[PDB]
Design an enzyme around this catalytic site. Structure first.
Site, PDB file in Angstrom:
ATOM      1  N   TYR B 143       0.690  -1.437   0.203  1.00 19.46           N
ATOM      2  CA  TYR B 143      -0.183   0.023   0.047  1.00 19.46           C
ATOM      3  C   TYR B 143       0.945   1.334  -0.006  1.00 19.46           C
ATOM      4  CZ  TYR B 143      -4.708  -2.134   0.660  1.00 19.46           C
ATOM      5  OH  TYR B 143      -5.846  -2.585   0.509  1.00 19.46           O
ATOM      6  N   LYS B 193       2.147 -15.509   1.313  1.00 22.79           N
ATOM      7  CA  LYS B 193       2.313 -16.206   0.029  1.00 22.79           C
ATOM      8  C   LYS B 193       4.080 -16.456  -0.054  1.00 22.79           C
ATOM      9  CE  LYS B 193       0.692 -17.841  -3.998  1.00 22.79           C
ATOM     10  NZ  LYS B 193      -0.254 -19.023  -4.153  1.00 22.79           N
ATOM     11  N   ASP B 225      -3.965 -18.138  -0.903  1.00 26.40           N
ATOM     12  CA  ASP B 225      -4.860 -18.904  -1.765  1.00 26.40           C
ATOM     13  C   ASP B 225      -5.491 -19.919  -0.947  1.00 26.40           C
ATOM     14  OD1 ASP B 225      -2.634 -20.241  -2.040  1.00 26.40           O
ATOM     15  OD2 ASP B 225      -2.771 -20.809  -4.117  1.00 26.40           O
ATOM     16  N   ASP B 249      -6.609  -7.214   3.630  1.00 25.47           N
ATOM     17  CA  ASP B 249      -7.900  -6.633   2.955  1.00 25.47           C
ATOM     18  C   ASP B 249      -8.719  -7.710   2.465  1.00 25.47           C
ATOM     19  OD1 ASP B 249      -9.273  -4.751   1.429  1.00 25.47           O
ATOM     20  OD2 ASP B 249      -8.171  -5.297  -0.342  1.00 25.47           O
ATOM     21  N   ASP B 253     -12.562  -9.153   4.475  1.00 29.32           N
ATOM     22  CA  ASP B 253     -13.707  -8.843   3.652  1.00 29.32           C
ATOM     23  C   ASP B 253     -14.375 -10.201   3.360  1.00 29.32           C
ATOM     24  OD1 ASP B 253     -13.976  -6.106   3.743  1.00 29.32           O
ATOM     25  OD2 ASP B 253     -12.886  -5.872   2.065  1.00 29.32           O
TER      26      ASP B 253
HETATM   27  C1  LIG Z   1     -10.586   2.127   0.244  1.00 28.22           C
HETATM   28  C2  LIG Z   1      -9.641   1.032   0.242  1.00 28.22           C
HETATM   29  C3  LIG Z   1      -8.288   1.498   0.015  1.00 28.22           C
HETATM   30  C4  LIG Z   1      -9.552   0.136   1.462  1.00 28.22           C
HETATM   31  C5  LIG Z   1      -8.327  -0.785   1.492  1.00 28.22           C
HETATM   32  O1  LIG Z   1      -7.814  -1.269   0.725  1.00 28.22           O
HETATM   33  O2  LIG Z   1      -7.794  -0.989   2.839  1.00 28.22           O
HETATM   34  C6  LIG Z   1     -10.759  -0.709   1.943  1.00 28.22           C
HETATM   35  O3  LIG Z   1     -10.933  -1.618   0.857  1.00 28.22           O
HETATM   36  C7  LIG Z   1     -10.602  -1.151   3.556  1.00 28.22           C
HETATM   37  O4  LIG Z   1     -10.661  -2.445   3.399  1.00 28.22           O
HETATM   38  O5  LIG Z   1     -10.581  -0.446   4.307  1.00 28.22           O
HETATM   39  C1  LIG Z   2       2.884 -22.849  -6.045  1.00 25.21           C
HETATM   40  C2  LIG Z   2       2.362 -21.631  -6.272  1.00 25.21           C
HETATM   41  C3  LIG Z   2       3.518 -20.945  -6.702  1.00 25.21           C
HETATM   42  C4  LIG Z   2       1.039 -21.687  -7.342  1.00 25.21           C
HETATM   43  C5  LIG Z   2       0.896 -20.038  -7.631  1.00 25.21           C
HETATM   44  O1  LIG Z   2       0.928 -19.183  -6.853  1.00 25.21           O
HETATM   45  O2  LIG Z   2       0.524 -19.827  -8.921  1.00 25.21           O
HETATM   46  C6  LIG Z   2      -0.140 -22.140  -7.034  1.00 25.21           C
HETATM   47  O3  LIG Z   2      -0.675 -21.668  -6.068  1.00 25.21           O
HETATM   48  C7  LIG Z   2      -0.992 -22.179  -8.356  1.00 25.21           C
HETATM   49  O4  LIG Z   2      -2.014 -21.648  -8.355  1.00 25.21           O
HETATM   50  O5  LIG Z   2      -0.678 -22.754  -9.324  1.00 25.21           O
HETATM   51 CA   LIG Z   3     -11.473  -4.087   1.781  1.00 23.18          CA
HETATM   52 CA   LIG Z   4      -2.855 -20.847  -6.231  1.00 24.79          CA
HETATM   53 CL   LIG Z   5       0.836  -5.870   1.434  1.00 23.81          CL
END
Ligand SMILES: CC(C)[C@H](C(=O)O)[C@@H](O)C(=O)O
Ligand SMILES: CC(C)[C@H](C(=O)O)[C@@H](O)C(=O)O
Ligand SMILES: [Ca+2]
Ligand SMILES: [Ca+2]
Ligand SMILES: [Cl-]
Ligand SMILES: [Cl-]
Lengths: 364, 364
Positions: B143, B193, B225, B249, B253
């Site tokens: 950010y 990650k 993921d 973030d 959510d």
């Molecule tokens: C508005 C946006 C920049 C913000 C973020 O990414 O932090 C919002 O998504 C949140 O979760 O407060």
């Molecule tokens: C192993 C990892 C690097 C890979 C990625 O992040 O692409 C996996 O999560 C995928 O979706 O293939």
């Molecule tokens: Ca958010």
């Molecule tokens: Ca993945």
């Molecule tokens: Cl980050």
């Protein structure tokens, strides 16, 4: 004329589901008169055991001499205490994508008729169904951006990664997305964090540039935090989702898990030549390996994507898809696709491969 | 002695739910003998209309003279065609976090007893319940990392953002997470990650360093993921989730949307002094504004978090929480918390605020 496939079955259930994909491919080769030669190479965990690294030089070179890579799954307990950065999955997959410039990842996911109840979504939401294709940019963004690394020591030691995208990298993945929407429900939902990231401001800008060539396709933009929520409420409203590398990683896996049926899901990663790497969406499931329980359908549909996208054999690819549909609607389901009071009707990996291949043979 | 609160109600339903938070606060001020003075400042959309920008100099300065910021919600249709980078939400929130060094974001989310059916999760999964606290690092990572911007032109024009973390930034957010787990179910799940990002390798390393001071808390690491999938299958197994800025973030959510009841969810963003910004988790809901329909509970629980974390008034904060519990189990529900055949039992924003404040008055 004669196609050459590098087969990289990897670890866990990789080899056993690969066996079924090859059996189905043999039926397709006979039905359609295709000449396909296959060579197997080690990758991932088995490559670390056999050759000291997850992507041996011989394997890399066998992929270079091939028309496509039919890839199984890599990783498991045995190697999961090496550094996360010398682990088999990232050590196989990232250099293959970088080396062959596999910029385009396609992950088709749908709720299959009759399997809605396996989705972890509430019943009124899964009843509506969904069919969402994720298009993920795979060779740019924060995965391969430089500078990447660390400097300093103690409390002020810091690490850094750089997310980087050029207009050219964005426009070629976006055209894939629009071209795909055109043949589906004609909507691209582009996913970014344009309120925070310079890469996302450029991303949204360039996607809007590419859109002019597709006046029949509807374009909308959504923030990644909002997309991860909305897929929980109205996944039936999305058609094609277009994403950068890191947002695509997250979103495609969220969508896969929403189907509740990962064993049915496959993945294509392609360069502009149509050389690609075709793999199931799910992992190596090492606890079920060697038992004939694993669902081979994901690996079989990987082979159909390979036939279509790399080998230009549309008819062969759709025959496999229909053989899969026939299995799913004729009571040929593996154990993870059944509610546990029905888990006694389960077919084994071999029964599934046999059924699917006989269906291709019979002219499905 | 006398506390000073900057009130920044913003746009949409902000002002109408703020009114109820203030009414509840007045009851708490009377019950507990607290002297709290409030000044209102424009922020977000209304600040763009009234002052030309989303975070006027006067507002920034009123926040500096306060002990905490009680914040409503910013944004809506009217401004949603400015650049994503001059929009009210990012234009208010990011400079407030950067200016006051609000490194720590806490987002408590639970499935409330009796409201499980509103979760978009399948019924057998929501029946289990969940209670997940997300701790998100808020002033570092991608950010506010530099360099950020773009260079070049045409096809080779590129944009870049830099994700950057130092050990000091990671250890202070991680200690918050461990300290919070210690008072809950004693598990931190750190989300990264690390198979791809240099920042995530350092992140996981430093979290493991901080862990030595918490031998009673269980620590596990998960890829982002994988975390987004697993929250769909076993959200009851997570206690505290620890995340960097961008992964937090997304994950907070996702968790909020999993409750199916965003109107109940609040958020604390704090610096090391305990100055913070307290806001509902959901948006400004501009289509329902001015109708007495909006659920004020998220804004009321924001005030309870403010009392606890910034004003050190634990008793006052828990009285508000219990007044909310009493509303929810006495038939005081707004329209979005009811199945539509029951939508005729709905309370208005004012009825909710009145009930909650009378409950604090009566000694709940
Ligand atoms: C508005 C946006 C920049 C913000 C973020 O990414 O932090 C919002 O998504 C949140 O979760 O407060
Ligand atoms: C192993 C990892 C690097 C890979 C990625 O992040 O692409 C996996 O999560 C995928 O979706 O293939
Ligand atoms: Ca958010
Ligand atoms: Ca993945
Ligand atoms: Cl980050
Ligand atoms: Cl990226």
């Amino acid at each position: 004329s004669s196609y050459q496939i590098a087969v990289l079955a990897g670890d866990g259930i990789g080899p056993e589901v690969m066996a079924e994909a090859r059996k189905v491919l043999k039926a397709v080769e006979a039905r359609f008169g295709l000449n396909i030669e296959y060579t197997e190479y080690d990758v991932g965990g088995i490559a670390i055991d056999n050759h000291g690294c997850p992507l041996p030089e011989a394997t890399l070179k066998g992929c270079e001499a091939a028309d496509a890579i039919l890839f199984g799954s890599v990783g498991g307990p045995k190697w999961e205490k090496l550094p996360p950065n010398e682990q088999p999955e990232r050590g196989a997959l990232l250099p293959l994508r970088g080396h062959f410039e596999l910029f385009c990842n396609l992950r088709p996911a749908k709720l299959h008729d009759g399997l809605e109840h396996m989705s972890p979504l509430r019943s009124d939401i899964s009843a509506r169904g969904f069919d969402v294709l994720c298009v993920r940019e795979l060779t740019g963004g924060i995965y391969f951006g430089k500078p990447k690394g660390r400097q300093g020591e103690g409390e002020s030691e810091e690490a850094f990664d750089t997310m980087r995208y050029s207009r050219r990298e964005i426009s070629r993945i976006a055209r894939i997305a629009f071209e795909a929407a055109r043949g589906r429900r004609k909507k691209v939902t582009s996913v970014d964090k344009a309120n925070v990231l310079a890469c996302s401001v450029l991303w949204r800008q360039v996607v809007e540039e590419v859109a002019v060539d597709f006046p029949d396709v509807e374009l909308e933009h959504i923030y990644i935090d909002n997309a991860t929520m909305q897929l929980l409420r109205r996944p039936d409203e999305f058609d094609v989702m277009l994403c950068s590398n890191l947002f695509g990683d997250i979103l495609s896996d969220e969508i896969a898990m929403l189907t509740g049926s990962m064993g049915l899901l496959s993945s294509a990663s392609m360069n502009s030549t149509g050389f690609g790497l075709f793999e199931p969406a799910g992992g190596s499931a090492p606890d079920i390996a060697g038992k004939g329980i694993a669902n081979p359908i994901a690996q079989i549909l990987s082979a159909a994507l390979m036939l279509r996208h790399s080998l230009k054999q549309e008819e062969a690819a759709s025959a496999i898809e229909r053989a899969v549909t026939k299995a799913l609607n004729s009571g040929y389901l593996t154990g993870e696709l059944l509610s546990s009071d029905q888990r006694h009707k389960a077919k084994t990996t071999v029964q599934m491969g046999d059924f699917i291949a006989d269906a291709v043979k019979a002219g499905v």
